[PDB]
């Protein structure tokens, strides 16, 4: 998906990392 989301720990096993989101949260974009 074009829309990226925030996720704790790390991105989904297949997503694309963008950067950091917050305390123990990373900003990534969904594979599908």
Swiss-Prot record:
Tissue: Paneth cells of the small bowel.
This protein's record includes keyword Ribosomal protein: no
Domain of life: Eukaryota
GO MF annotations, alphabetized: phospholipid binding
GO biological process: antibacterial humoral response; defense response to bacterium; disruption of plasma membrane integrity in another organism; killing of cells of another organism
Localization terms from the record: Secreted; Cytoplasmic vesicle, Secretory vesicle
GO CC annotation, single: transport vesicle
Cysteine pairs bridged by disulfides in the record: 4-29, 6-21, 11-28
Keywords, alphabetical: Antibiotic, Antimicrobial, Cytoplasmic vesicle, Defensin, Disulfide bond, Secreted, Signal
Keyword Secreted: yes
Function according to Swiss-Prot or TrEMBL: Host-defense peptide that has antimicrobial activity. Exhibits activity against Gram-negative E.coli (in vitro). Probably contributes to the antimicrobial barrier function of the small bowel mucosa.
Protein family per UniProt: Belongs to the alpha-defensin family.
Protein name per its UniProtKB record: Defensin alpha 4
Phylogenetic lineage: Eukaryota, Metazoa, Chordata, Craniata, Vertebrata
Annotated gene: Defa4
